[PDB]
């Protein structure tokens, strides 16, 4: 029972259903690109992302002098068909590994159920889909069929290791912080991984360590999938709510500040930098946001743009936000039901808890310094397996996380750049 039913090949013909030419919301008039529906409401564009940002239309790097040490530029990556095939199967295998844990199995089920809310209409009482929460799928005629989706895995932009989770905004709505949600676009590559040190003292020092170990890409993708789970349920923290790092002299020296959002995503001790007063206000702030959505659903008189019934589309959102329905049929938010749902996306879906269940070596905090970038190929089963990743079972790579050791398993990790 796999999460991704098909063994997609980039070379596969477009059938117009789960393999089709599509158009993403973009500032230009982009040419359609090939995308694969690996799962319900999840698509994979194995292209470099020149479309989401109007100022990053090209993959040219900045002047050699304006480049920051922690970056890697390569305009030729993911440009040829063979890398597009390998990229697609790598992303697919990474979903299988996440899904093979009850924790990731729940995360992926919460994402597919987290439909961006239908707050698009200009009339108070009718429900409508926000256009930017959809994609344009090409038909055989050449006509364009609009289709809804929740997640999109796309290739990196100019900065190859600038992994992130982004969505398109609304002129009058704050979809990521009002509960509604929005289709998420993740820049991610299964062919690259960051180097880090097992020794915490070395890992928190900018000037030491050369990337003794390698991050497991399923944790990296699991980290960005948690960003999606926050933004899809509309409970993300404003990215300008930053923490004045006082626990790392090297951060304090440079005056760095990490956003509460990423600290929450990492979890563990990191998520405790947020003080109880700050956590309390957000929970209450978004508990009220679900009440506004429950109020909008109760004042729903019509539905536009689909053949689904009004009652049916309310039900999709009762199951998403876990609203309570009384005898008369009016939706409400049960504070305890919400608190269970709120804690799930904030304290349970964390990079830390995922490392515990993958049983991999990982950074022990978000406040560290990346030591190197490696080129990996996770598609061969002699390199990387769904159930064990790099630390293959029964081999010498299982003990002491040896499979993640970039010198003991020196054939699976090719160093490209030294940040240290």
């Amino acid at each position: 029972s796999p999460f991704v039913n098909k063994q997609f090949n980039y070379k596969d013909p477009v059938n117009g259903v789960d393999i089709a030419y599509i158009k993403i919301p973009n500032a230009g008039q982009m040419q359609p690109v090939k995308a694969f529906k690996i799962h319900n409401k999840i698509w994979v564009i194995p292209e470099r992302d020149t479309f989401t940002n109007p100022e990053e239309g090209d993959l040219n790097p900045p002047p050699e002098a304006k480049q920051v040490p922690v970056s890697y530029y390569d305009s030729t990556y993911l440009s040829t068909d063979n890398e597009k095939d390998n990229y697609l199967k790598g992303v697919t295998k990474l979903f299988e590994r996440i899904y093979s844990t009850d924790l990731g199995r729940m995360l992926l089920t919460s994402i597919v159920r987290g439909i961006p809310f239908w707050g698009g209409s200009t009339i108070d009482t009718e429900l409508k889909v926000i256009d930017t929460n959809c994609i344009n799928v090409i038909q055989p005629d050449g006509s364009y069929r609009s289709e809804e989706l929740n997640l999109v895995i796309i290739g990196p932009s100019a900065d190859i290791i600038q992994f992130e989770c982004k969505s398109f905004g609304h002129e009058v709505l704050n979809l990521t912080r009002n509960g509604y949600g929005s289709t998420q676009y993740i820049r991610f590559s299964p062919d690259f991984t960051f180097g880090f040190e097992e020794s915490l003292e070395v890992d928190t020092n900018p000037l030491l360590g050369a990337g003794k170990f390698a991050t497991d890409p399923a944790v990296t993708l699991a980290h960005e999938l948690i960003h999606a789970g926050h933004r899809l349920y509309g409970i993300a923290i404003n990215p300008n709510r930053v923490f004045k790092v006082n626990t790392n002299a090297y951060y304090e020296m440079s005056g760095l500040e990490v956003s509460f959002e990423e600290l929450r995503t990492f979890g563990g001790h990191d998520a405790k930098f947020i003080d109880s007063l700050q956590e309390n206000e957000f929970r209450l702030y978004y508990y009220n946001k679900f009440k506004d959505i429950a109020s909008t659903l109760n004042k729903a008189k019509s539905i536009v743009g689909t053949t689904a019934s009004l009652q049916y589309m309310k039900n999709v959102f009762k199951e998403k936000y876990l609203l309570s329905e009384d005898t008369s049929g009016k939706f409400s938010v049960d504070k305890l039901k919400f608190d269970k749902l709120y804690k799930m996306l904030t304290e349970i879906y964390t990079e830390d808890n995922f490392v515990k269940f993958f049983k991999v070596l990982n950074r022990k905090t978000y406040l560290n310094f990346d030591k190197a970038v490696f080129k990996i190929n996770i598609v061969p089963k002699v390199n990387y397996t769904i159930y064990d990743g790099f630390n293959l079972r029964n081999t010498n790579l299982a003990a002491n996380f040896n499979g993640q050791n970039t010198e003991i398993n020196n054939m699976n990790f090719t160093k490209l750049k030294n940040f240290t």
């Binding site: 158009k23 993403i24 919301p25 973009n26 500032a27 230009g28 008039q29 982009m30 989401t52 940002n53 109007p54 209409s121 200009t122 009339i123 256009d131 930017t132 344009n136 364009y144 609009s146 398109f168 905004g169 002129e171 009058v172």
Partner: protein
């Protein structure tokens, strides 16, 4: 002699002020040097927001200060696209009066005429229809 220092970015305050229809706040921020063509993280200009929320006097004061009537966001919509969507006839007339492109197309191919008829704005669609056939 009269040197002031900007403690906060004036673009974001101008965009927030135009979104909530605080005409005096827009007019005051414009006096202290806010950029009428600044952008938010989504490509929205003060005119995009002032037009989508329906503020006639805010739209005019900005256009007087040199706001791009044909600037587009990250999905290709212009101030004319938004004003037709939210049923603002007076805003749509002002934008046209200043030479907004009635044929601007967003990512999906839609013009401000399509958005108008797709949101039940008949009287605002007949104006855009006529202006196109002129």
């Amino acid at each position: 002699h009269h040197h002031h220092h900007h403690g906060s970015d004036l673009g974001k305050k101008l965009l927030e002020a135009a979104r909530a229809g605080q005409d005096d706040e827009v007019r005051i921020l414009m006096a202290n040097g806010a950029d009428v063509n600044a952008v938010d993280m989504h490509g929205y200009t003060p005119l995009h927001l002032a037009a989508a929320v329906g503020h006639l006097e805010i739209v005019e004061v900005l256009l007087k200060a040199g706001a791009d009537v044909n600037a587009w966001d990250q999905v290709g919509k212009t101030p004319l696209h938004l004003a037709a969507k939210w049923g603002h006839l007076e805003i749509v007339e002002v934008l046209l009066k200043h030479g907004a492109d009635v044929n601007a197309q967003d990512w999906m191919g839609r013009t401000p005429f399509d958005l108008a008829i797709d949101n039940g704005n008949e009287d605002i669609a007949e104006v855009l229809q006529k202006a196109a056939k002129l």
